Write an enzyme that holds these catalytic residues in place. Structure first.
Site, PDB file in Angstrom:
ATOM      1  N   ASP A 181       0.862  -1.188   0.000  1.00  0.00           N
ATOM      2  CA  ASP A 181       0.000   0.000   0.000  1.00  0.00           C
ATOM      3  C   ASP A 181       0.903   1.244   0.000  1.00  0.00           C
ATOM      4  O   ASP A 181       2.173   1.137   0.171  1.00  0.00           O
ATOM      5  CB  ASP A 181      -0.960  -0.133   1.177  1.00  0.00           C
ATOM      6  CG  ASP A 181      -2.122   0.830   1.082  1.00  0.00           C
ATOM      7  OD1 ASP A 181      -2.119   1.677   0.114  1.00  0.00           O
ATOM      8  OD2 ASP A 181      -2.991   0.744   1.992  1.00  0.00           O
ATOM      9  N   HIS A 321      -9.313  -2.757  -8.310  1.00  0.00           N
ATOM     10  CA  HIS A 321      -9.448  -1.688  -7.287  1.00  0.00           C
ATOM     11  C   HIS A 321      -8.796  -0.380  -7.752  1.00  0.00           C
ATOM     12  O   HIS A 321      -9.488   0.650  -7.746  1.00  0.00           O
ATOM     13  CB  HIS A 321      -8.928  -2.152  -5.935  1.00  0.00           C
ATOM     14  CG  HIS A 321      -8.985  -1.106  -4.868  1.00  0.00           C
ATOM     15  ND1 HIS A 321     -10.166  -0.528  -4.451  1.00  0.00           N
ATOM     16  CD2 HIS A 321      -8.007  -0.607  -4.072  1.00  0.00           C
ATOM     17  CE1 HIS A 321      -9.890   0.309  -3.460  1.00  0.00           C
ATOM     18  NE2 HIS A 321      -8.550   0.314  -3.232  1.00  0.00           N
TER      19      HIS A 321
HETATM   20  C1  HEM Z   1      -9.876  -2.617   3.290  1.00  0.00           C
HETATM   21  C2  HEM Z   1     -10.079  -1.761   2.257  1.00  0.00           C
HETATM   22  C3  HEM Z   1      -9.081  -1.435   1.212  1.00  0.00           C
HETATM   23  C4  HEM Z   1      -7.983  -2.120   0.780  1.00  0.00           C
HETATM   24  C5  HEM Z   1      -7.547  -3.473   1.271  1.00  0.00           C
HETATM   25  C6  HEM Z   1      -7.335  -1.326  -0.218  1.00  0.00           C
HETATM   26  C7  HEM Z   1      -6.141  -1.704  -0.862  1.00  0.00           C
HETATM   27  C8  HEM Z   1      -5.478  -0.904  -1.758  1.00  0.00           C
HETATM   28  C9  HEM Z   1      -4.257  -1.253  -2.400  1.00  0.00           C
HETATM   29  C10 HEM Z   1      -3.470  -2.534  -2.175  1.00  0.00           C
HETATM   30  C11 HEM Z   1      -3.918  -0.206  -3.198  1.00  0.00           C
HETATM   31  C12 HEM Z   1      -2.700  -0.159  -4.115  1.00  0.00           C
HETATM   32  C13 HEM Z   1      -1.546   0.696  -3.622  1.00  0.00           C
HETATM   33  C14 HEM Z   1      -1.421   2.023  -4.314  1.00  0.00           C
HETATM   34  O1  HEM Z   1      -1.625   2.223  -5.526  1.00  0.00           O
HETATM   35  O2  HEM Z   1      -1.066   2.944  -3.651  1.00  0.00           O
HETATM   36  C15 HEM Z   1      -4.930   0.778  -3.085  1.00  0.00           C
HETATM   37  C16 HEM Z   1      -4.938   1.982  -3.766  1.00  0.00           C
HETATM   38  C17 HEM Z   1      -5.980   2.879  -3.668  1.00  0.00           C
HETATM   39  N1  HEM Z   1      -7.126   2.744  -2.949  1.00  0.00           N
HETATM   40 FE1  HEM Z   1      -7.564   1.298  -1.751  1.00  0.00          FE
HETATM   41  N2  HEM Z   1      -8.018  -0.180  -0.369  1.00  0.00           N
HETATM   42  C18 HEM Z   1      -9.100  -0.164   0.438  1.00  0.00           C
HETATM   43  C19 HEM Z   1     -10.113   0.786   0.582  1.00  0.00           C
HETATM   44  C20 HEM Z   1     -10.195   1.951  -0.197  1.00  0.00           C
HETATM   45  C21 HEM Z   1     -11.238   2.890  -0.177  1.00  0.00           C
HETATM   46  C22 HEM Z   1     -12.459   2.830   0.729  1.00  0.00           C
HETATM   47  C23 HEM Z   1     -10.933   3.849  -1.127  1.00  0.00           C
HETATM   48  C24 HEM Z   1     -11.667   5.042  -1.555  1.00  0.00           C
HETATM   49  C25 HEM Z   1     -12.977   5.171  -1.403  1.00  0.00           C
HETATM   50  C26 HEM Z   1      -9.688   3.486  -1.707  1.00  0.00           C
HETATM   51  C27 HEM Z   1      -9.050   4.244  -2.643  1.00  0.00           C
HETATM   52  C28 HEM Z   1      -7.797   3.903  -3.152  1.00  0.00           C
HETATM   53  C29 HEM Z   1      -7.111   4.812  -4.086  1.00  0.00           C
HETATM   54  C30 HEM Z   1      -7.523   6.183  -4.614  1.00  0.00           C
HETATM   55  C31 HEM Z   1      -5.973   4.162  -4.407  1.00  0.00           C
HETATM   56  C32 HEM Z   1      -4.889   4.660  -5.339  1.00  0.00           C
HETATM   57  C33 HEM Z   1      -5.198   4.384  -6.821  1.00  0.00           C
HETATM   58  C34 HEM Z   1      -4.177   5.010  -7.723  1.00  0.00           C
HETATM   59  O3  HEM Z   1      -3.834   6.214  -7.603  1.00  0.00           O
HETATM   60  O4  HEM Z   1      -3.722   4.276  -8.636  1.00  0.00           O
HETATM   61  N3  HEM Z   1      -9.275   2.293  -1.164  1.00  0.00           N
HETATM   62  N4  HEM Z   1      -5.892   0.344  -2.182  1.00  0.00           N
END
Ligand code: HEM
Length: 467
Positions: A181, A321
């Site tokens: 993350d 995601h």
């Molecule tokens: C338990 C819940 C969640 C898990 C396990 C999870 C996991 C991850 C992972 C592994 C990444 C990739 C790392 C990265 O690109 O920085 C990521 C990116 C991201 N997540 Fe989540 N996430 C969760 C909940 C959320 C929620 C609720 C939101 C927004 C409503 C969110 C928004 C984002 C965004 C904006 C990114 C970056 C995408 C990008 O710029 O490419 N995530 N998340």
């Protein structure tokens, strides 16, 4: 004007560095005393300026604490601070009112939240981030003393305390499903002056109220503050693993082992390998060297193939995601002001213990663990709410896709409209992209509650909040 980083709370820009972090959710029981007490907290509040010093000290190495504070609409009301022009319906209405539309499970409509988030009047949250439990606990005793907690001068009552902890050893910086993350954040113009390849710059007012790019009269006390979205998101790790194990991708030729097929499916649910290597760059194998290189691990935009091409989910499913939460070229055809407006800064931390042998072998969750999700934005409607509700929860996003394609739900956070949450996802098999994968009835991520807060500037804390 340049950003005054000594006026901005340090979790917003830079972020509070941490191995552990405690969220202290409080109710104000004595407004006059609280405003006097807050004068003594202000010197403890870590600014972005101090974070940049702190990060320089960590990078050269350490007992280190960071402290921020944020207020709900209910807290501003209690203090008599008129927030008629602060944010919009989302902050004013509170997260409980938004739970149904976010898609949270209910027995409705009342969401299936922890009692403290559901029942209770949360006025604010104090964030304490540190190198160790010892550092955070010591700082919390000092902050409790300032607000008279445990004594007859108390101005606040504890509603809930939640502790987060970075995961151990080689899983440090990974969330509980096992994925790296904290890779992709928007580059804030005037702060992130050296964006990585693929890291889009945003005007500061996407994050900071009252700065260039903040598309909303504001109260003067809201300048250089940011809205803090908190969500406690429980993770069902053995259940997630069971789903991957039961659904390995078989590519033409049947060369992958079941283990490799299940691993590839995991990478295609998130958009990255667990290492952090993005699948748009390395679609069919991990690349640990790529994953560690910030000059390379974000340098993609879903442009080869682009969304509108036949079979365009070859490298990354639409519903992965990261492709749901940052659509990159799926929308970057639209205005720079429009696409920058959807960006959030994420500052969450995992919580709970590691999966036990019994949980692992039985394939069933016994212990509460997950993500303390935190994000910052100047506009909750444009950021967190839009990402969750218009993108993650929308099976027919994005419109740049071919008309016959139905992407389905974000398999990590996507929530369906009725308690009958039948969720599907297309595109996970790169050689049979029309094939639907039925997600389990039991979600992998179970929202347990949260609130919408506002992190004021230092000058706002001094000149408006404090007495
Ligand atoms: C338990 C819940 C969640 C898990 C396990 C999870 C996991 C991850 C992972 C592994 C990444 C990739 C790392 C990265 O690109 O920085 C990521 C990116 C991201 N997540 Fe989540 N996430 C969760 C909940 C959320 C929620 C609720 C939101 C927004 C409503 C969110 C928004 C984002 C965004 C904006 C990114 C970056 C995408 C990008 O710029 O490419 N995530 N998340």
């Amino acid at each position: 004007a340049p950003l005054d980083l000594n006026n901005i709370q340090g979790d917003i820009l830079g972020g509070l560095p941490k191995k552990t972090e405690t969220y202290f959710f409080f109710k104000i029981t004595d407004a006059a005393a609280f405003r006097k007490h807050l004068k003594q907290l202000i010197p403890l509040i870590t600014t972005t300026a101090q974070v940049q010093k702190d990060r320089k000290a960590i990078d050269e190495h350490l007992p280190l604490a960071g402290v921020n504070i944020a207020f709900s609409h209910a807290g501003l009301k209690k203090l008599g601070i008129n927030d008629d022009n602060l944010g919009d319906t989302a902050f004013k209405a509170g997260q409980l009112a938004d739970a149904q539309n976010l898609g949270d499970p209910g027995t409705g409509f009342v969401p299936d939240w922890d009692p403290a988030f559901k029942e209770k009047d949360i006025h604010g949250v104090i964030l304490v981030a540190g190198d160790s439990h010892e550092t955070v606990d010591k700082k919390l005793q000092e902050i409790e003393a300032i607000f008279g907690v445990g004594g007859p001068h108390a101005s606040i009552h504890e509603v809930l305390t939640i502790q987060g902890d970075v995961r151990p050893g080689d899983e440090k910086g990974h969330e509980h499903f096992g994925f790296q993350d904290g890779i992709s954040q928007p580059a804030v113009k005037g702060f992130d002056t050296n964006p990585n390849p693929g890291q889009a710059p945003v005007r500061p007012g996407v994050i900071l109220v009252g700065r260039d790019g903040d598309s909303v009269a504001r109260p003067s006390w809201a300048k250089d503050g940011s809205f803090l979205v908190f969500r406690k998101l429980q993770q069902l790790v053995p259940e997630f693993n069971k789903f991957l194990e039961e659904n390995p991708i078989k590519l033409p030729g049947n060369n992958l082992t079941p283990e490799e097929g299940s691993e590839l499916l995991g990478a295609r649910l998130v958009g990255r390998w667990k290492s952090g290597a993005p699948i748009d760059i390395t679609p069919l194998q991990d690349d640990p060297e790529l994953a560690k290189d910030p000059q390379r691990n974000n340098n993609f935009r879903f442009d080869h193939p682009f969304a509108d091409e036949q079979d365009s989910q070859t490298r990354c499913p639409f519903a992965a995601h990261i492709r749901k939460t940052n659509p990159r070229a799926d929308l970057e055809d639209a205005s720079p002001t429009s696409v920058e407006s959807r960006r959030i800064i994420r500052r969450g931390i995992p919580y709970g213990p590691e999966v036990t042998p019994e949980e692992k072998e039985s394939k069933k969750t016994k212990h509460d663990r997950g993500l303390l999700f935190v994000c910052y934005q100047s506009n909750i409607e444009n950021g967190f709410q839009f990402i969750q509700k218009s993108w993650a929860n929308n099976p027919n996003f994005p419109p740049s896709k071919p008309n016959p394609v139905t992407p389905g739900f974000d398999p990590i956070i996507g929530q369906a409209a009725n308690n009958d949450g039948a969720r599907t996802m297309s595109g996970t098999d790169p050689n049979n992209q029309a094939n639907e994968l039925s997600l389990p009835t039991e979600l992998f991520v179970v929202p347990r509650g949260g609130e919408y807060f506002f992190s004021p500037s230092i000058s706002a804390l001094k000149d408006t909040f404090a007495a």
